[PDB]
């Protein structure tokens, strides 16, 4: 039953899961359509007497299901926009088995819940806890960026994104059903999604350009665009992406920031290079070339 529910919880068949557990426990537990009461109420039977060996036992599976299901429930309630129902289940993840990556993600998630509720000073505690206990400290810095944006402290927001950029550079299993199997790959909208260095560097430079530090923003733009164009030797940097603005718009933003910096010859060279490589963006190319 532990294994079955692991498959169904990895594949999102919670309607079948809760029905299985209603059948398993007494059907007097019939209107308890909640899972996280049925998973707890579910009581494996024995101290596992002198029987054939096993890599894992029902309690070491139940302690996994509860924390995985509680995390999942919490992230769904957050993204669906009920960050008061989160806190319960996202504390029920940490009040249990929790490998310490699951703990870091629970703390970022709770930073997120409190930010949404309008409690920045509580949210900062949880993000600080996550930085401390974790070795994957991208998402905390991201959530802090979003939080200083919510406030206004924009130089601080930008410093957090700088640190995140530095943090995306730095980098075992068990023959046993862990918790890091029953977690999904994170959605785009969740607080635990962090992109790739290219996307994040564009986010930095965009959010710096809007703020008006065009010299710094242009420096970041060139240090981005090099990572797409100059790169042939090392591992390939991921695309900023199809949902995000395409190549030509990036050249355009680069040239605009470069003009604001006062590097008109470099802007001209970029525009000429774009035209050599190849609409609206061509008319605009001529426009920026004029202002140069």
Name the residues that contact another protein, by CB under 8 A. Answer: 94-100, 103, 119, 121-122, 125, 132
Query: How far is it, in rounded angstroms, from Cα 258 to Cα 249?
Result: 14
Work out how close the CB of 118 gets to another protein at its nearest, in angstroms, rounded to a whole number.
9
- Comparing CB distances to another protein, the nearer of 111 and 195 is 111
Work out how close the CB of 120 gets to another protein at its nearest, in angstroms, rounded to a whole number.
9
- Comparing CB distances to another protein, the nearer of 47 and 233 is 47
Query: How far is it, in rounded angstroms, from Cα 205 to Cα 220?
Result: 6
Work out how close the CB of 94 gets to another protein at its nearest, in angstroms, rounded to a whole number.
7
Residue 200: partners with Cβ closer than 8 Å, 6 or more residues away? 161, 164, 165, 168, 194
Closest CA to 113 of 192, 27, 219, 231: 192
Whether 134 and 104 have beta carbons less than 8 Å apart is answered as yes
Work out how close the CB of 125 gets to another protein at its nearest, in angstroms, rounded to a whole number.
5
- Comparing CB distances to another protein, the nearer of 126 and 251 is 126
Cβ count within 10 A of residue 27: 8
Work out how close the CB of 114 gets to another protein at its nearest, in angstroms, rounded to a whole number.
9
- Comparing CB distances to another protein, the nearer of 128 and 168 is 128
Q: What are the residue ranges of helices labelled H in the chain?
A: 2-10, 14-24, 38-41, 58-80, 86-94, 101-117, 120-133, 139-151, 154-167, 197-211, 214-229, 247-261, 264-277, 280-291
Closest CA to 284 of 258, 252, 246, 237: 252
Query: How far is it, in rounded angstroms, from Cα 66 to Cα 63?
Result: 6
Work out how close the CB of 97 gets to another protein at its nearest, in angstroms, rounded to a whole number.
7
Work out how close the CB of 96 gets to another protein at its nearest, in angstroms, rounded to a whole number.
6
Q: What is the DSSP string of 89-155?
A: HHHHHHSS---SHHHHHHHHHHHHHHHHHT-HHHHHHHHHHHHHH-S--SHHHHHHHHHHHHH--HH
- Comparing CB distances to another protein, the nearer of 175 and 280 is 175
């Amino acid at each position: 039953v532990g294994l079955q529910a692991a498959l169904w919880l990895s594949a999102d068949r919670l309607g079948d899961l809760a029905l299985l557990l209603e059948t398993l426990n007494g059907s007097q537990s019939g209107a308890s359509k909640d899972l996280l009461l049925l998973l707890k109420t579910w009581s494996p039977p024995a101290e596992e007497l002198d029987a054939p060996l096993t890599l894992q036992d029902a309690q070491g599976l139940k302690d996994v299901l509860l924390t995985a299901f509680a995390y999942r429930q919490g992230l769904q309630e957050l993204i669906t926009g009920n960050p008061d129902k989160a806190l319960s289940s996202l504390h029920e993840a940490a009040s249990g088995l929790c490998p310490r990556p699951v703990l870091v993600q629970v703390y970022t998630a709770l930073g997120s819940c409190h930010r949404k509720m309008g409690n920045p000073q509580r949210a900062l505690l949880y993000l600080v806890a996550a930085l401390k206990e974790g070795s994957a400290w991208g998402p905390p810095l991201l959530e802090a960026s979003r939080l200083y944006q919510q406030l206004g402290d924009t130089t601080a927001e930008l410093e957090s994104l700088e640190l995140l950029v530095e943090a995306l550079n730095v980098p075992a299993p068990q023959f046993l059903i862990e918790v890091e199997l029953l977690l999904p790959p994170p959605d785009l909208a969740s607080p635990l999604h962090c992109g790739t260095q290219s996307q994040t560097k564009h986010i930095l430079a965009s959010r710096c350009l809007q703020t008006g530090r065009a010299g710094d923003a242009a420096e970041h733009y060139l240090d981005l665009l090099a990572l797409l164009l100059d790169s042939s030797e090392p591992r390939f940097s991921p695309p900023p992406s199809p949902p995000g603005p395409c190549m030509p718009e990036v050249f355009l933003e680069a040239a605009v920031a470069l003009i604001q910096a006062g590097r008109a010859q470099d802007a001209l060279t970029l525009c000429e290079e774009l035209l050599s490589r190849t609409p609206l963006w061509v008319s605009a190319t001529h426009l920026l070339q004029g202002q140069a």
